[PDB]
Subunit: 142 residues, 4 copies
Amino acid sequence: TYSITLRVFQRNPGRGFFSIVEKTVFHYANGGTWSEAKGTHTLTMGGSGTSGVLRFMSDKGELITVAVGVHNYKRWCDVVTGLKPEETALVINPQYYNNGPRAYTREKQLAEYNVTSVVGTRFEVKYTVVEGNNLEANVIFS
Amino acid sequence: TYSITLRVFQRNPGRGFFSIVEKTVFHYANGGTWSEAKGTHTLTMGGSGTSGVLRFMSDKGELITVAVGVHNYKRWCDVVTGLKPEETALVINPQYYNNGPRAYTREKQLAEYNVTSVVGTRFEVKYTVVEGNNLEANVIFS
Amino acid sequence: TYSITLRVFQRNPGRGFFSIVEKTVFHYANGGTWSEAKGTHTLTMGGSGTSGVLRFMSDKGELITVAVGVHNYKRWCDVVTGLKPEETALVINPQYYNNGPRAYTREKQLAEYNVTSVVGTRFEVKYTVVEGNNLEANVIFS
Amino acid sequence: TYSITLRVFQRNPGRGFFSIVEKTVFHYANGGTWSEAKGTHTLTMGGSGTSGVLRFMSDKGELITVAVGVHNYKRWCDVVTGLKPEETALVINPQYYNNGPRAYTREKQLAEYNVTSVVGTRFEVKYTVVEGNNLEANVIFS
Ligand SMILES: CC(=O)N[C@@H]1[C@@H](O)[C@@H](O)[C@@H](CO)O[C@@H]1O
Ligand SMILES: CC(=O)N[C@@H]1[C@@H](O)[C@@H](O)[C@@H](CO)O[C@@H]1O
Ligand SMILES: CC(=O)N[C@@H]1[C@@H](O)[C@@H](O)[C@@H](CO)O[C@@H]1O
Ligand SMILES: CC(=O)N[C@@H]1[C@@H](O)[C@@H](O)[C@@H](CO)O[C@@H]1O
Ligand SMILES: CC(=O)N[C@@H]1[C@@H](O)[C@H](O)[C@@H](CO)O[C@@H]1O
Ligand SMILES: CC(=O)N[C@@H]1[C@@H](O)[C@H](O)[C@@H](CO)O[C@@H]1O
Ligand SMILES: CC(=O)N[C@@H]1[C@@H](O)[C@H](O)[C@@H](CO)O[C@@H]1O
Ligand SMILES: CC(=O)N[C@@H]1[C@@H](O)[C@H](O)[C@@H](CO)O[C@@H]1O
């Protein structure tokens, strides 16, 4: 099994406050499950080769997704911003597979990624434990 | 908009205790979002014609999904039991659409549904507010 | 240290639906902390001789407290029903100590307790692991 | 009635990550209740003259309390850091009343407060809606 445990940091009240509105798990590698403990979020997966997505909405209406997973035994991540209401995590998660338009990002096996949305919100995913089967990352909104 | 607010009742400790492991929203009708308040769960959707799925796992390992949505201005529900780890909510939710194998169940526009899993767990979804745009249902595990 | 992990089973929609409105920890035995994981609640305490209280409110306005702790190396529990709004958990938890009016109930060291309230709600606390330092109980509203 | 709604912003992973371990409500003004919605925390109180406390613990072991309430129709707040395990919120909340050692801080009726702890964690409470019965504040750990 692989697990990825996420801690969500929110830095700047001027951007609003984000909460989870959707959590998906892709079906490869015997799937997996999201759980919550002590304010953190863990994605537990049946092996290497799958992922999950958290979609967040701010109290100012902004929609963004955070994807994390393991590809060929190495962690990966992505953040997609500027989403329309119909672009749910259910739409987004599969786009990393089956030659979809986000596969290239999974293939990078990134330990960190940064993006600013068009409306000016900074997002970062930074793995703090980057190797092995019990991975850890901070997700930072600013 | 349509909303469906769910209250989860668990009746029988002998079946174990269930918690949410995934929440999806289908992309029709401008999508929608899950939220939590006072121990309840609300799916807020952009109009009639979409749905969302909660997947639950018990502390005894059982996996089941609960689907709720609105089809042609009437509520619907379903429960799928006996799921394998790879049959995530991300797999299940789309199966109600595009002539998928669960579409017939959405088309029934049920205000209640009952099923017992092969391992003996009873599940019921029962709408308590069955008309209008602010729907309410109890989800009962036993 | 001692821990008590609680699973809350709400059986009967006719009583309405309860959510937590307060959680206290008494200061003996070097105190302790409440945490949440996978829909459960754990009180971790620094030794034998302290306790914590969860207060619940139903969406029909009913207020009740559940107390759990360890007294002379044995678990105890209590449920107080029919509470007024001014009777917060902060009021109730100390009443088990300093020769307060609920001390006798702590002293019973009960592994199960059943009480039905003035509005008809049935409450049960039943420990499923009743000995040792890693205690487990079901809290059932019916 | 008065309500205070809190949004918790954790800015700095270097301080570790905090989660709630206790929530108390003082018994004046007919008491009150904590609730959670969309990742936020609301204390609802029966009138002016009471308060509640959230205690937080970081995954590095740090214990701190945030107190919020209404005194003579004006909001107040306080943050206490460097707490010992025996100094539970149940100990701290009453210290603002009955001529206790923190009463002066309540009496200040602060709309903002900044304190940095012995281990270097910066805390700020800042009310964003500072008048009326529907109060709002950001709680920032940095
Ligand atoms: C071992 C491993 O991670 N295998 C994965 C496989 O499961 C699938 O995700 C594929 C997608 O292009 O990428 C890899 O081959
Ligand atoms: C108005 C309405 O609910 N329309 C829906 C549409 O959105 C889609 O879900 C379709 C699937 O067969 O079922 C209906 O036509
Ligand atoms: C060892 C042990 O549990 N000691 C406790 C002590 O901590 C205190 O709670 C007292 C209350 O009357 O009951 C016992 O003596
Ligand atoms: C109206 C009002 O806020 N009254 C309060 C009262 O309830 C109590 O908290 C007291 C503490 O010294 O401070 C004020 O007098
Ligand atoms: C502005 C923005 O959010 N762009 C995203 C980018 O972050 C992401 O890596 C890519 C692949 O999923 O899709 C979009 O280009
Ligand atoms: C035993 C079991 O869970 N059967 C489910 C049924 O409940 C559901 O309505 C149907 C359509 O989704 O799929 C399966 O037949
Ligand atoms: C009806 C009711 O809630 N009675 C409670 C009882 O359960 C509790 O054990 C006792 C001591 O705390 O106080 C009250 O008698
Ligand atoms: C370093 C620290 O946490 N000091 C606190 C201060 O913040 C608080 O206002 C006061 C009254 O409660 O108690 C302590 O002096």
